[PDB]
Symmetry: D3
């Protein structure tokens, strides 16, 4: 029985990048790289590409791999998303990640064909893990797939695939607790990663999370790093940070809750536009757009949060200590 360091690539704050559109609605890879570099410069530790935030279903496999290569060539630590329509595609993403020197793998379950069958999932995960043996890997778990990776399966996979060192949960606080209690609190180098924007405090403080993959953090990087830092200080036992982390998470809650729904890319791209990044204006599908009411709601809530934060962020104590 062994004690091992957790994988550095799954620590800290990690945006799942959006893919900006050129005016012709093809990917603007230059703008992708610029945003990635900017977010690392703001204090992010790595990025995830191409995930749901990156519009993976709307892009070809070649386009995703080009985006991955461009990010890696720029010196950005990349965790590669393996979401796919089939095993061959998922494997290809993983093989390409290892080939080009990405630093991590996000292993996404099988969809559309045998989605609920646990035997199918086991084989699919093994195929993906086998294709990038040298890359630390995190498995995504969500009720969306009609199945759950439990401890038995996780440890069976890990016994055959030593690169499986992480677990990322979308499915709610109770599911994250299940993971912390039964999977990720061994001695042995396995990390729980926060996998939805609304679960940051719960993940770091109540579940021993090592890192957070963020949607809203693409828009509000300094504020999301601030929350993550406060939450990590709270996990050390700090009194002041534990209060402050909760205040900030609650103020962020509406804008973070867009990460939970179908329109996450619509909402987050519109927020990028609101803060002056016009390249986030168009979507890959010509008719994908927020409604008039949805745009008004997000604009109102964006303004509210920015106003609150402008004053709250001046408070002495943990608020200052934990800034990015």
């Amino acid at each position: 029985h062994h004690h091992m360091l957790k994988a550095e690539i799954f620590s800290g704050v990690i945006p799942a990048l959006m893919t900006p559109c050129k005016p012709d609605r093809s990917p603007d890879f230059d703008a992708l790289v610029r945003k990635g570099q900017e977010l690392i410069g703001d204090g992010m530790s790595a990025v995830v590409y191409c995930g749901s935030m990156g519009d993976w279903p709307l892009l070809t496999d070649a386009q995703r791999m080009e985006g991955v290569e461009r990010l890696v060539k720029a010196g950005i630590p990349v965790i590669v998303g393996t979401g796919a329509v089939n095993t061959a595609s998922a494997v290809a993403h993983a093989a390409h990640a290892q080939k080009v020197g990405a630093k991590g793998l996000m292993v996404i379950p099988r969809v559309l064909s045998r989605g609920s069958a646990i035997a199918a999932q086991k084989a699919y995960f093994k195929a993906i893990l086998s294709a990038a043996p040298d890359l630390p890997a995190v498995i995504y778990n969500s009720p969306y797939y009609g199945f759950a990776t439990r401890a038995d399966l996780f440890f069976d996979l890990r016994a055959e695939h030593p690169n499986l060192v992480g677990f990322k949960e979308f499915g709610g606080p109770a599911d994250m607790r299940y993971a912390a209690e039964n999977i990720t609190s061994r001695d042995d180098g396995v990390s729980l990663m926060i996998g939805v924007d609304t679960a940051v405090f719960h993940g770091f403080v109540n579940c021993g999370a090592t890192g957070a993959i963020t949607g809203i953090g693409n828009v509000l990087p300094k504020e999301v790093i601030h929350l993550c830092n406060l939450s990590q200080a709270a996990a050390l036992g700090d009194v002041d940070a534990r209060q402050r982390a909760q205040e900030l998470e609650q103020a962020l809650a509406v804008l973070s809750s867009f990460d939970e729904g179908p329109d996450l890319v619509l909402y987050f791209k519109h927020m990028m536009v609101l803060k002056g990044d016009k390249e986030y204006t168009l979507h890959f599908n010509e008719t994908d757009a927020l409604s008039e009411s949805q745009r008004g709601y997000v604009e109102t809530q964006f303004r509210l949060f920015n106003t609150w934060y402008a004053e709250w962020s001046k408070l002495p104590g943990a608020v200052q200590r934990c800034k990015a």
Copy 2:
């Protein structure tokens, strides 16, 4: 595409009035008018009559209309409740509201006959709206009716009935969020109204509500206005009010939660009696009364809240700024 002012009648804090009984268990209209005048004097903006709080099912249509006329003649801004056993009655309430110069209409869904049929509801709402074309109207939405008014129906009604300018939700925070995101955050003068006592902070801060119809506010008007003011200041981005509004809402939560259940009129009338308004002693039905345990519970919780509030309400800062 237009920007328009929200209807003033659906702004601020608005009690849904109880109908006091005379000793013979007929309505005491004089006492109704006195309470209405008092609550406006305390800082309420309008009243709702005759709603569920007013015991509408227990009163004749003529009695409700008499109460409405008496309130209007006294100079009180009245939003008229159209709850009814049938379309003809609901229409009559609406027509009477317009005739006598009430300022708003609360449009209540069809019950008892075709309650779950959305085609029935659409026609019923159109009949009611058509009967008071000059009065701003709010539609009530609750899971109790076995159906939900969604954005499609709301906007279809509004296209034919320009007086439909409001939406009032009973069904929980998620339903209120649905309404804010998809219905009430357009540019065009439509208001979300808080429609249950426990949802005040969530409505104003997270959902952009313009006003609150209140049950507990009949009993604790100054305290409920205080909460609404704090919540509205929080919606401006204030740090201190956002903390204080939540403290007050939590202290009020038990007494507000009676608004959620079948015995709301029993509980609220007994609270009116506790604060010295003896005309709230009797109910229209001779056997409707709280149990011994229910009376003890409410008395204990009333005393608790009053004790807490007496000291908390002296705190400096937003607490003082936002008093009625």
Copy 3:
């Protein structure tokens, strides 16, 4: 401990009558009486008036009582529906039933005010039962009311109100079984009544029901009596009837299932029109009507059932023995 005969008024097949409209959309009482007389002549044992099938919420209390008096004066055994917006109305229906010599009382729970409170229901049932002490009474039980009358309450009511001798269940086969096991299979003269059109076989054979209140039986009286007779012969142990009752119930199932939904009066009145009773054309509300697709569906299913029945009803054995 006693053995007593079940109340004759709650035996056999009992239509819950529709209220036909005159062209001005007021009740056609003459047509009501003609239909009642016709259905008794077809083999029905009694009628229920004014129930949900009779559009009670759309009619005034005076109109319902006029319909009741007219039926009673014609010599028809009447079970009076006490559905009401309030206790005073429900009591008035019951008092009027006893005054005019109706033969039974259908006791309907409280709605709109304190609907889910069991203390309210107990008091409401006692008020109604007390108002017609001389009339055998059946309590209606349905999940629609947000509460269930269980054995404890039923027997407590019966101890104070000896006229409570029946139980009518809308809520599904399991609820009917609960009633048979725990309420209606004592020695003591209490009857289970089938209370939804789709539960006839289950009620008579599996639950020991004594009678059936029917919606579809207004339209297809001979066929519904045939099913009830077959089911009762099956309850004697007959082999052939037990097979045949199930075949007929299954063939009737679509048309019977309209009794389960909000549009029951729409569907059943349209079926009355299809068989040539034009006085069932209009509804009390001008806009209540089946859609084009709903009319097509019912017409197709009506024709199907009539075609099947025309041949099936010629079969030898229990089919012939059990005809009305």
Copy 4:
């Protein structure tokens, strides 16, 4: 208001074809065409390609279109499946269907990106319908997508897209009834199609279905046509067929129920192998295979059904009249 003939392409019995593998696990188009021709020769009216039964997610868009072209060139009436990872792909399938002269379009909802958003679905369906204006189209509806096409949306689409003439339901008997009552029983040429193998009798007799898309029918074409014929004769009012259709559906129920689950292609391809079609041995994914217990179960149930059918199919009357 108009009466119009239902589209012939959506009548009768229609297998959703499996894509056989060559030994190299690429599609065997020759074997696909041979099976299609054989099934039409057995009595099937049309085929669906490439649906879930055809392993669409595992095949490239070019491969699906090649299969479609090969079937069409062979003279087989083809309904084209538009299942896709994105709008551009779904549109391409539809455009290709129209280009090559397929006879119908199966319109499959959006997945993976905005799957639950009804605004997204509406736009997606319009894009697909617009791409093949000349082809009769059926929309698939299933709870799997996190949304339901109701009558409002269906009729809104149909008003702009006259080729939308069909509705196919996976979601259970109640959902099929909803469709029959509210969508497909107008006068106007719209067809309900049975969309899961276990719902044949319910669709034809209780819901007025015009045709059935079948999985198990690829394996047992004569037996599935027999059931469909019996069910259609039952829908005419036949007594004997109504009994026999139900006996056959019940005997077929286990083998049909595999159509409901994730392993449908595994189970049905293994059944094809059992009846001597070795080209159905391999799957596109090397590790997709039934377990030892699953193979034993299906083999046992296949043998059972064949034994029962061998004798039952000799019975006189409707059994003989309704054979393929």
Copy 5:
């Protein structure tokens, strides 16, 4: 990979015996043995003692073991129930079963302490299986325990404990199908046992069951054997038996459904009394008794079933062929 015969002890029809009371409410072991011998003489293959039907929680461990020894000494094949308050007791039952020469073991999950923990269940099952290595063993699976034994656990246990050769399901038709598909249809000698009285046809015909443990069969042995024989003939492909088995199961359904509920021993002991076995009059607890209504219901349903059966059982064909 191996083919092996299923264990004979888990084939056929097997009553779970009631423990009759002496007048002092201690067990009447003499009467227990007499009933066991009688039921084997009627055609039962084995018995289960002491299960829930045997009132295990009400008896001491020593009493259960005495009953087991007495049955075994009489020459009756006994499957021993290991239900227990703790591991030590469950192990003791198993060890005693092996010591005295019982023929099988019914392995019952852990309760009261760590009931929902799957790690606890695994260890508990291993402890029980290890204590009787020479006895074929069946694991009971029910939602009552807050957990389910799936294929993974079953096969893991079986790999370490070769005596685990059976699976018994209480939890409904879908759970029994899961077991047939994934656990019990391998080549390798594992048996599915019907474990609730209402699932006989479904188990034998749809799920490949080898045997049935019965409650109602203690009361109606010849009739339950008749149903089991008909169901087994139906599983061979017989047409007539498949019809008849379903008719008999449906006629038996009410009396069988008592096996599903908390009062099973109350209902079944009262039925034993009705057929003249007075030693089934008393229960171990002085106040455990059916209510007046429950006794009336069961008496009515017992009489109904006996009357139906008396005539139905004379029918020619499979009815005669399959009698005990």
Copy 6:
């Protein structure tokens, strides 16, 4: 109608004691008494023995009674747990409690035999209460039993059994509110007891609880007394305590939540070991142990809470006023 003092034995903070093991895995009664004395010395008011925390199912009745006698002889106020496999055992525990001079009775519902039958529960509770007429008694209520004691049953029992003076709820905040509103807020000396570790603030402040039975309090007595004192001061109306009680409850929430699950004794005994009480190392079952991940999780959360508390507990105001 009377006002009466609540029973002192059900006031304050009351650990449900663990039973430590000797190395041979028999109970260490000496260590049990030492811990009981220590916890009373820390500020606890009484103890509960032998409850679920005490491993009751794993111990003989004689062992539990020995533990009870030893605690009572030591001068510790004991509330005796009556959890049992049958009525005779439960009665024996109660009779023994009264015989030896325990101060209270915890009345636990019937399990394993007729668990869901309310008639069985009523009789079982009466048997237990009758056996210790002189001891104040609290009934435990939990969804785990498949039934709920409501006000009707509680007051019926209390009318026949004047020693029934308490109610203890496991089932969640809404169930505790139901109890406060309808059972425990009469004038008449009935106490609500907090019955799960996570419900302390809600019980004292929102529900008028008089005492708390605690699991985590065995490990963290001073901290749990601190929370209870703060919560009781909050129930007086204190502003500062109401804030502080909630901060402490939230910091304690993870460690308290182990009380909600199957592994409560595993988690709490391991925490006792962590604070240096080695006699809590072994469990009665040799294989009952936390997993590696569960041990890591609890150790991390224990350390976190202790670190936070070390600093938070120095704060001025209510924090200091309310220390044990």
